[PDB]
Amino acid sequence: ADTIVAVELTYPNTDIGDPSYPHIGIDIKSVRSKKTAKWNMQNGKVGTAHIIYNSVDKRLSAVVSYPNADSATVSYDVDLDNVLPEWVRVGLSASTGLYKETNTILSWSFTSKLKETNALHFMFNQFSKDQKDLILQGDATTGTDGNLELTRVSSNGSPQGSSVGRALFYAPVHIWESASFEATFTFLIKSPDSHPADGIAFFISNIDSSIPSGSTGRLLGLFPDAN
Amino acid sequence: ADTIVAVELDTYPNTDIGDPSYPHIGIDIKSVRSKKTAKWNMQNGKVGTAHIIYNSVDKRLSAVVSYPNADSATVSYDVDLDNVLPEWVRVGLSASTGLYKETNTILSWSFTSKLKSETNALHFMFNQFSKDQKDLILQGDATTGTDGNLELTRVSSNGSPQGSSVGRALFYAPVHIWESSAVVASFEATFTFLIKSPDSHPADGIAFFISNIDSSIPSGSTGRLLGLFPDAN
Ligand SMILES: Cn1cc(CO[C@H]2O[C@H](CO)[C@@H](O)[C@H](O)[C@@H]2O)nn1
Ligand SMILES: [Ca+2]
Ligand SMILES: [Ca+2]
Ligand SMILES: [Mn+2]
Ligand SMILES: [Mn+2]
């Protein structure tokens, strides 16, 4: 199977370890986050996510926030060095199940540095209908109002259940030789209920990664099961 | 045929096809016959630096080649990439040898593109090349890793260059160079190179190029063709 490392953001699946509230988390080869923190989600408002990892501290951190609101942050010690392969791909993933929400990405940026220093950086502030430097998987689409819609949305912007989609940057990224990065994304999660599902995530995986069979809902397009 | 826009650093004068009587720098728009050239005082065995810039405002392509202490050689040309190239392209480096040869070693390479349609950007920096550089598409005789360098054309087990060779390296991801409702980018490329020919006669040159995403070495583009063009039209 695939090797995944992710920062996840919406629906509590307590039977699989989640806490009773919306949670922010760090996933290392399992959907059962190694660490989490309370995320006071705001339906229909634009959020920001910041992820950073430095090879010095060997620590992955994430912060999510809304204008004039307190942010949530989670940190976790881990040597990517021993978890992921040398080359990887970076992407955004999201899903819905019985419940849903829009999983709109308004922007996405990324920087990798491997110190003769080698680097990669990309900035997406608008998304085009034919974004060739993105690899869309599943239900993801680009174009609508220049946004990236990870899961299925209707003509009127109404979301749909049982949907899963990812978007991976076309070029592979070198993250280790024996190595820092930063990621940022702006999102819009919106639901007509008051129990959105299932969340969004930034992830790093093997270059050939793809959505696992059946990974909608709680599995967030990332994991084949819940172990 | 592929669509190419390139900046060449030509060590071999091919008089019968427009090369001036000396090593030179040139800008190539869909043909190996440069729209504009400038004399280049190539210094054999010395590390050079090439800088290529393009801005949407001027819509002017420029290039400067240099070495330490010596004076630079520069060339410019006005062109609308929105008119010449497809909207998504791939960027790369290409080189070749023919009856005469030279090493075409790349020590470093970086690229930056900006598209204010506010901006979408792409930047890459290669200060060393690994033996299995997955973010690069190698074509032809091109290899990476040896000395942490990129060798565009074939080099023998003892630091010697082979003739009739050709190779290219392309960045894996496609690059958006024009939107239509946004004439940018807006790009800049830099590479560092080492061309040495144990012969008093080096050939054929190195080039930075932009092409259709599926571009590939045209069969027979050795020598004067620099790995870019299929003929000399
Ligand atoms: C005990 N229990 C069972 C369910 C069924 O939930 C569906 O809807 C959820 C939110 O869409 C998904 O997390 C889940 O994977 C599944 O698809 N909810 N609570
Ligand atoms: Ca959950
Ligand atoms: Ca020539
Ligand atoms: Mn969770
Ligand atoms: Mn020439």
From Swiss-Prot, chain A:
Biological role: D-mannose specific lectin. Displays antiviral activity and therefore may contribute to defense against infections.
InterPro entries: ConA-like_dom_sf, L-lectin, Lectin_LegA_CS, Lectin_legB_Mn/Ca_BS, Legume_lectin_dom, Leguminous_Lectin
Similarity comment text for this entry: Belongs to the leguminous lectin family.
Name this polypeptide is given: Concanavalin-A
Additional remarks: Binds one manganese (or another transition metal) ion and one calcium ion. The metal ions are essential for the saccharide-binding and cell-agglutinating activities.
Superkingdom classification of source: Eukaryota
Provenance organism: Canavalia ensiformis
Chain positions recorded as a carbohydrate binding sites: L98, Y99, D198, R218
Modified how: The mature chain consists of residues 164-281 followed by 30-148. To form a mature chain the precursor undergoes further post-translational modification after removal of the signal sequence; cleavage after Asn at positions 148, 163, and 281 is followed by transposition and ligation (By formation of a new peptide bond) of residues 164-281 and 30-148. This maturation (circular permutation) relies on the legumain AEP1 activity and leads to an increased stability of conA after heat stress and at various pH.
GO MF annotation terms: D-mannose binding; metal ion binding
Subunit comment: Homotetramer.
Positions of Ca(2+) binding: Y11, N13, D18, D198
Gene Ontology process terms (BP): defense response; regulation of defense response to virus
Pfam families: Lectin_legB
Keywords from the UniProt entry: Antiviral protein, Calcium, Glycoprotein, Lectin, Manganese, Mannose-binding, Metal-binding, Plant defense, Signal
Binding annotation for Mn(2+): E8, D18, H23
